[PDB]
Amino acid sequence: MKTITLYLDPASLPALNQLMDFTQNNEDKTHPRIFGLSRFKIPDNIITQYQNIHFVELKDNRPTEALFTILDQYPGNIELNIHLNIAHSVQLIRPILAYRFKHLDRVSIQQLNLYDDGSMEYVDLEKEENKDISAEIKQAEKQLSHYLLTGKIKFDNPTIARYVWQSAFPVKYHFLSTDYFEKAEFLQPLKEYLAENYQKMDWTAYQQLTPEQQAFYLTLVGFNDEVKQSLEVQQAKFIFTGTTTWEGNTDVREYYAQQQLNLLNHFTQAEGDLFIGDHYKIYFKGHPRGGEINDYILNNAKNITNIPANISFEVLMMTGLLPDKVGGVASSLYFSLPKEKISHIIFTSNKQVKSKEDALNNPYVKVMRRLGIIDESQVIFWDSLKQLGGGL
């Protein structure tokens, strides 16, 4: 037969892992490949080095019907090697199972490789606490069997459904936090069920690639040499995480840029409440939607190195270029960070968070606290920091 590999992900983390898989197998120039990675545009000069390579858009977390046209180009017996985002696995595989159903004579599922979207999977599993996990699993398995047989979707428990693929196909899960599954008592039935089918996400694959492949990977993920060089200095590094705006009783964006600079001063100045130390080189990681606010912050922030709001903390870890310390305005991105690299996370005002107490009740913060990733003292509410000036 012929194996066709599909790489699907509307997010970032699974995509980064899938592009690494592609890189590791990049010596094979003809293996049929279908890319449905919404946030990554593979450069033209990489695509033209390969044959039987295809691209499909995702719509509402599903590859479009355009997928069928591509699969039709392979009239023989085909086996699908599928890579998916765990949280969105059910939707992503729908068109694939629909096609299989229509061509049960020549199409089969070879195996699945699933990767965490991020904090989402964990925040969702927390909501299943108190349920009979063993029973939830068994019911999901039965409903998946039906899904494979008719291509129809119907799960009593969408969250647990993300983890019962082994009941139908050979699978391998790559988790951001294996500790979560092994430490959460209520998930013991699921941990035991998954057995040998899961492993911790591998962040050192990049270190094992040939020099040529490392360069190839960086091009795939859009991490250019300029940014990389700025992150290889032989000095301690601190990255400040910017945000957009919050409930500050004003619609003036310049105010939010001003206050974010104030928050940064608490890390960079000895007079700050969160002073990280004079020996740190400072970097700014603006929010992807920060827009002109990022320009304001960079312009008024003395001696600071910008990290394209484009680059993600996930790619920094994948490449082993994550700075020594990360701090600033809170974001679910902090969930993926190693405990030792987290300094202080600052929460801004919104509908759900109006105090430090509310911040400690944030969905991902609750998981992090449980796992001992952070202490309550590392969670700060923005209004508690006084106005501070910068330096020369």
Residues 163 and 254 in one domain: no
Residue 391 lies in a domain: no
Q: Note whether residue 214 is domain-resident.
A: yes
Q: Determine how many CB atoms are found less than 10 A away from the CB of residue 18.
A: 25
For residues 183 and 109, state if they share a domain.
yes
> CATH number for the domain including 310?
3.40.50.11110
Burial 219-250 (b: 16+ CB within 10 A, else e): bbbbbeeebeeebeeeeebbbbbbbbbeeeee
Q: Are residues 86 and 166 in the same domain?
A: yes
Residue 326 sits in the same domain as residue 258: yes
Residue 255 within any structural domain of the chain: yes
Q: How many CA atoms lie within 13 A of 232 on its CB side?
A: 7
Tell me whether residue 242 is annotated as binding: yes
Would the annotation count 119 as a binding residue? no
Please tell me whether residues 176 and 233 are part of one structural domain.
no
Please calculate the CA angle 245-247-249 and round it to the nearest 5 degrees.
110
DSSP string, 127-177: TTTTS-HHHHHHHHHHHHHHHHHH-----S-HHHHTT-GGGTS-EEEEES-
Q: How many CB atoms lie within 10 A of CB 261?
A: 24
Q: Considering 154, 186, 209, which residue would you say is the last residue of a domain?
A: 209
In sequence order, which ranges of the chain are alpha helices (DSSP H)? 13-24, 44-47, 66-71, 89-102, 119-126, 133-150, 158-161, 178-183, 188-194, 205-208, 211-220, 225-230, 253-268, 292-300, 313-318, 356-360, 363-370
Can you tell me which residue has the tokens 């459904």?
161
CATH of the domain at 195: 3.40.50.11120
Model resolution, angstroms: 1.6
In this structure, which amino acid lies at residue 326? V
Q: Do 200 and 253 fall within a single domain? A: no
Both tokens of residue 24?
């590791």
| 100 assigned to some structural domain | yes
In a domain, 176, yes or no: yes
Asked whether residue 301 is domain-assigned, the answer is yes
- Tell me whether residue 355 is annotated as binding: no
Non-local CB neighbours of 6 within 8 Å, separated by 6+ positions: 33, 34, 36, 63, 80, 81, 82, 83, 96
Distance from C-alpha of 93 to C-alpha of 74, rounded to nearest angstrom: 19
Q: Which residue, 164, 192, 209, sits at the end of a domain?
A: 209
Name which of 341, 342, 316 is nearest 228 in CA terms: 316
Contact predicate 38/114, CB 8 Å = no
Largest CA distance in the chain: 72
Q: How far apart are CA 283 and CA 286, in angstroms?
A: 10
CB proximity list for 256: less than 8 A, separation 6 or greater? 243, 244, 245, 246, 248, 293
Residue 390 lies in a domain: no
Is residue 78 a part of any domain in this protein? yes
Q: Which residues of 57-87 are buried (b: 16+ CB within 10 A; e: fewer)?
A: ebeebbbeeebbebbeebeeebebbbbbbbb
Which class for 302: exposed (0-12), middle (13-18), buried (19 or more C-beta within 10 A)? exposed
How many other CB atoms are there within 10 angstroms of residue 255's CB atom? 14
Do 221 and 361 fall within a single domain? yes
What is the identity of the amino acid at 57?
E
Flag whether 285 is marked binding. yes
How far apart CA 330 and CA 243 sit, in angstroms, is: 8
* 279 labelled binding-site residue: no
Pairing of strands 342-347, 379-381: parallel
Domain check: are 49 and 160 in the same one? Answer: yes
3-state secondary structure of 223: coil
Q: Is 314 annotated as a binding residue?
A: yes
Same domain, 193 and 172: yes
Are 202 and 288 found together in one domain? no
CB 246, CB 256: distance < 8 Å: yes
CA distances, 162 to each of 30, 248, 275 (Å): 31, 39, 42
131 is in an annotated binding site: no
DSSP of 310-342:
TS-HHHHHHTT---SEEEEE--GGGGGS-GGGE
On whether 336 is known to bind a ligand per the annotation, the reply is no
Cα 2 from Cα 299, distance rounded (Å): 55
* Exp. method: X-ray
Residue 283, CA distances (Å) to 127, 168, 241, 363 in order: 36, 47, 9, 27
Domain match, 205 and 261 both: no
Considering the domain architecture, whether residues 130 and 218 belong to the same structural domain is answered as: no
- Angstrom CA distances, 180 to 117, 130, 135, stand at 15, 16, 20
DSSP letter at 353 equals -
Provide the number of structural domains found in the chain.
2
Alpha-carbon span 218 to 315, nearest angstrom: 9
At 224, the amino acid letter reads N
Integer distance in angstroms from the first to the last C-alpha of the chain? 67
**Domain of residue 364, residue span:** 210-385
Read off the tokens for 220: 């795939």
At which of 149, 179, 209 does a domain end? 209
